[PDB]
Design an enzyme around this catalytic site. Structure first.
Site, mmCIF file in Angstrom:
data_model
loop_
_atom_site.group_PDB
_atom_site.id
_atom_site.type_symbol
_atom_site.label_atom_id
_atom_site.label_comp_id
_atom_site.label_asym_id
_atom_site.label_seq_id
_atom_site.Cartn_x
_atom_site.Cartn_y
_atom_site.Cartn_z
ATOM 1 N N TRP A 16 2.194 -1.361 11.681
ATOM 2 C CA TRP A 16 3.361 -0.886 10.918
ATOM 3 C C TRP A 16 3.551 0.590 11.133
ATOM 4 O O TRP A 16 4.602 1.153 10.786
ATOM 5 C CB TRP A 16 3.199 -1.127 9.426
ATOM 6 C CG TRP A 16 1.927 -0.500 8.868
ATOM 7 C CD1 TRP A 16 1.786 0.759 8.371
ATOM 8 C CD2 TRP A 16 0.630 -1.122 8.761
ATOM 9 N NE1 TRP A 16 0.492 0.964 7.939
ATOM 10 C CE2 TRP A 16 -0.243 -0.170 8.190
ATOM 11 C CE3 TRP A 16 0.121 -2.390 9.108
ATOM 12 C CZ2 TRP A 16 -1.601 -0.447 7.953
ATOM 13 C CZ3 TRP A 16 -1.211 -2.669 8.845
ATOM 14 C CH2 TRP A 16 -2.053 -1.704 8.265
ATOM 15 N N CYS B 171 -4.887 -3.532 14.313
ATOM 16 C CA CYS B 171 -4.196 -3.340 13.050
ATOM 17 C C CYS B 171 -4.143 -1.856 12.729
ATOM 18 O O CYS B 171 -5.066 -1.116 13.086
ATOM 19 C CB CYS B 171 -4.901 -4.069 11.926
ATOM 20 S SG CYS B 171 -4.081 -3.844 10.363
ATOM 21 N N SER C 242 -1.493 -5.686 4.125
ATOM 22 C CA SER C 242 -2.379 -6.709 4.671
ATOM 23 C C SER C 242 -3.574 -6.891 3.745
ATOM 24 O O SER C 242 -4.358 -5.958 3.541
ATOM 25 C CB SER C 242 -2.826 -6.350 6.084
ATOM 26 O OG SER C 242 -2.895 -4.974 6.196
ATOM 27 N N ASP D 296 -1.218 -6.467 14.168
ATOM 28 C CA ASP D 296 -0.646 -6.349 12.824
ATOM 29 C C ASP D 296 -0.424 -4.855 12.540
ATOM 30 O O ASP D 296 -1.254 -4.175 11.922
ATOM 31 C CB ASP D 296 -1.595 -7.020 11.806
ATOM 32 C CG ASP D 296 -0.914 -7.319 10.490
ATOM 33 O OD1 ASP D 296 0.305 -7.597 10.527
ATOM 34 O OD2 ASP D 296 -1.595 -7.250 9.433
HETATM 35 C C1 FAD Z 1 2.670 -6.051 7.590
HETATM 36 C C2 FAD Z 1 2.387 -4.727 6.975
HETATM 37 C C3 FAD Z 1 1.140 -4.440 6.493
HETATM 38 C C4 FAD Z 1 0.896 -3.218 5.934
HETATM 39 N N1 FAD Z 1 -0.314 -2.961 5.474
HETATM 40 C C5 FAD Z 1 -0.574 -1.792 4.919
HETATM 41 C C6 FAD Z 1 -1.897 -1.446 4.395
HETATM 42 O O1 FAD Z 1 -2.821 -2.242 4.432
HETATM 43 N N2 FAD Z 1 -2.078 -0.257 3.867
HETATM 44 C C7 FAD Z 1 -1.110 0.618 3.811
HETATM 45 O O2 FAD Z 1 -1.336 1.703 3.306
HETATM 46 N N3 FAD Z 1 0.112 0.383 4.263
HETATM 47 C C8 FAD Z 1 0.446 -0.764 4.809
HETATM 48 N N4 FAD Z 1 1.716 -0.983 5.297
HETATM 49 C C9 FAD Z 1 2.760 0.016 5.155
HETATM 50 C C10 FAD Z 1 3.285 -0.080 3.734
HETATM 51 O O3 FAD Z 1 3.970 -1.296 3.640
HETATM 52 C C11 FAD Z 1 4.260 0.987 3.334
HETATM 53 O O4 FAD Z 1 5.199 1.089 4.381
HETATM 54 C C12 FAD Z 1 3.604 2.327 3.071
HETATM 55 O O5 FAD Z 1 2.573 2.152 2.130
HETATM 56 C C13 FAD Z 1 4.568 3.343 2.514
HETATM 57 O O6 FAD Z 1 5.239 2.819 1.410
HETATM 58 P P1 FAD Z 1 5.804 3.743 0.333
HETATM 59 O O7 FAD Z 1 6.584 3.035 -0.605
HETATM 60 O O8 FAD Z 1 4.771 4.557 -0.184
HETATM 61 O O9 FAD Z 1 6.702 4.569 1.301
HETATM 62 P P2 FAD Z 1 8.216 4.988 1.344
HETATM 63 O O10 FAD Z 1 8.584 5.645 0.118
HETATM 64 O O11 FAD Z 1 8.941 3.862 1.832
HETATM 65 O O12 FAD Z 1 8.137 5.981 2.523
HETATM 66 C C14 FAD Z 1 8.297 5.478 3.816
HETATM 67 C C15 FAD Z 1 8.391 6.558 4.865
HETATM 68 O O13 FAD Z 1 9.729 6.914 5.115
HETATM 69 C C16 FAD Z 1 9.860 8.318 5.096
HETATM 70 N N5 FAD Z 1 11.168 8.681 4.569
HETATM 71 C C17 FAD Z 1 11.403 9.358 3.474
HETATM 72 N N6 FAD Z 1 12.704 9.516 3.299
HETATM 73 C C18 FAD Z 1 13.318 8.947 4.303
HETATM 74 C C19 FAD Z 1 14.687 8.741 4.727
HETATM 75 N N7 FAD Z 1 15.715 9.192 4.038
HETATM 76 N N8 FAD Z 1 14.883 8.090 5.845
HETATM 77 C C20 FAD Z 1 13.899 7.624 6.580
HETATM 78 N N9 FAD Z 1 12.645 7.768 6.241
HETATM 79 C C21 FAD Z 1 12.299 8.411 5.143
HETATM 80 C C22 FAD Z 1 8.770 8.799 4.192
HETATM 81 O O14 FAD Z 1 8.403 10.122 4.467
HETATM 82 C C23 FAD Z 1 7.678 7.826 4.480
HETATM 83 O O15 FAD Z 1 6.915 8.259 5.584
HETATM 84 C C24 FAD Z 1 1.970 -2.224 5.849
HETATM 85 C C25 FAD Z 1 3.214 -2.512 6.331
HETATM 86 C C26 FAD Z 1 3.460 -3.733 6.898
HETATM 87 C C27 FAD Z 1 4.817 -4.062 7.428
#
Ligand code: FAD
Length: 389
Positions: free
Chosen positions: A389, A342, A170, A387
């Protein structure tokens, strides 16, 4: 531009938002959209494409056996295996059942192939749910469990590993204050799966370590795009608003406070605004503390009530500070206030959702079904936005 198909945008600034005393991390990042067709509005989301960590890519290369110096056309024009594994293969999420079917087809060990087919069959749905999903086993851990499953290059990208999805954020800035920069507030994700795998968030780690143009020319960059949202401020500033997002839930409200501060450097009367913020400790993760107090010095924000998760004997959260302020927020609703939420959707949202259900009763004299249906109508009216997640 098209949202889904990205614009090569550059990272201008990259800063840590927590103090060095904090044991967690949250990054403030600004993308440079100057010279690009990208446009955004306050409350919109920015989709970001990233890449896998090099060690994760290495483990995949070890399991697959391909030559990383092989060029191929992924259904970049031709791409190497290493770069396809970095930018286009979701390696750490759990394989779907069709992916297991494809692994089995190429498993040369009868026992391993039988177990893979079983995990994908209905008879295996219970073991799949625990050993794959509940344990959060990555595709890479499944493949190590069955080292005889050696799918060819084309099958692997077409059926075994899905595309590396973009991560949404966001936007935490307003175009009036910075139409050249897309600001993001991104918390570092670093967890341990139930099965004991150390998982680094793919995007949050790439953001935490990105090189900004403000510190070097050889700076990071990411394919980004903007997604329009309905998380928007009301038409005219007279309408009062209630904002509740703690921690990273603060993100869109930073743009909310930037948008109204910009307008009322030349706009209309302020209108009441209250920001419910929460974090662990004022000395640890009170992100944007100076900026918040500046918004209160001017007419942007009117009241900032704080909830501290681990500062003092009483462990407080935003919903605990809401029930104490339950008298004035009710007044705000009758004045036509919009309410924004949010941040974390599993707990904070659920608890905030069920605390204004309970204060529309005491301060509203309705029972459950009448308070429930009333809150639902605030959503349909468009006055209760989430909003999460
Ligand atoms: C509309 C929206 C707005 C957002 N805004 C923000 C924001 O402002 N700031 C913010 O920090 N984030 C925000 N997010 C969340 C962000 O998009 C990410 O989801 C978050 O930062 C994690 O991404 P990543 O790639 O680091 O995580 P990933 O690598 O995708 O990790 C995701 C999670 O899944 C877990 N995981 C690991 N392995 C597995 C597996 N095999 N199966 C299932 N789960 C597992 C991980 O431990 C972790 O907790 C937002 C999400 C949405 C949808």
């Amino acid at each position: 531009h098209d949202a889904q198909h990205p614009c090569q945008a550059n990272v201008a600034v990259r800063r840590e938002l927590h103090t060095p005393a904090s044991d967690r991390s949250c990054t403030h990042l600004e993308f440079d959209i100057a010279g690009t067709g990208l446009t955004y509005e306050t409350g919109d989301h920015v989709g970001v494409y990233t890449e896998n960590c090099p060690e994760v890519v290495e483990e995949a290369e070890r399991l697959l056996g391909y030559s990383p110096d092989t060029f191929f056309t992924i259904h970049p024009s031709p791409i190497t295996v290493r770069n396809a594994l970095a930018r286009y293969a979701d390696l750490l999420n759990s394989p779907k059942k069709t992916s297991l079917v494809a692994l089995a087809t190429y498993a040369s060990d009868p026992a391993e192939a039988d177990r893979l087919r079983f995990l994908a069959s209905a008879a295996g749905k219970d073991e799949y749910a625990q050993w794959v999903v509940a344990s959060q086993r990555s595709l890479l851990e499944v493949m190590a469990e069955f080292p005889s499953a050696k799918p060819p290059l084309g099958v692997f990208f077409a059926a075994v590993a899905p595309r590396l999805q973009p991560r949404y954020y966001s936007i935490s800035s307003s175009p009036s204050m910075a139409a050249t920069r897309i600001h993001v507030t991104c918390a570092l994700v670093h967890e341990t799966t139930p099965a004991g795998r150390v998982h680094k968030g793919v995007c949050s780690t790439w953001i935490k370590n990105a090189v900004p143009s403000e510190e070097s020319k050889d700076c990071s960059w990411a394919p980004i795009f903007v997604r329009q949202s309905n998380f928007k401020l009301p038409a005219d500033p007279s309408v009062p608003i209630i904002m509740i997002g703690p921690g990273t839930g603060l993100a869109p409200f930073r743009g909310f406070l930037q948008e109204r501060l910009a307008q009322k450097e030349s706009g209309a009367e302020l209108g009441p605004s209250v920001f419910f913020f929460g974090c662990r400790n004022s000395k640890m993760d009170f992100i944007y503390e100076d900026e918040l107090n500046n918004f209160l010095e001017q007419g942007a924000l009117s009241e900032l009530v704080l909830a501290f998760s681990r500062q003092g004997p009483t462990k407080e959260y935003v919903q605990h500070k809401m029930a104490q302020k339950a008298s004035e927020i009710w007044d705000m609703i009758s004045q036509g206030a919009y309410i924004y939420v949010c941040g974390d959707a599993k707990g904070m949202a659920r608890d905030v959702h069920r605390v204004l259900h309970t204060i529309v009763q005491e301060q509203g004299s309705l029972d459950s079904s009448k308070a429930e249906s009333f809150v639902k109508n605030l959503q349909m009216e468009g006055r209760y936005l989430r909003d999460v997640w």
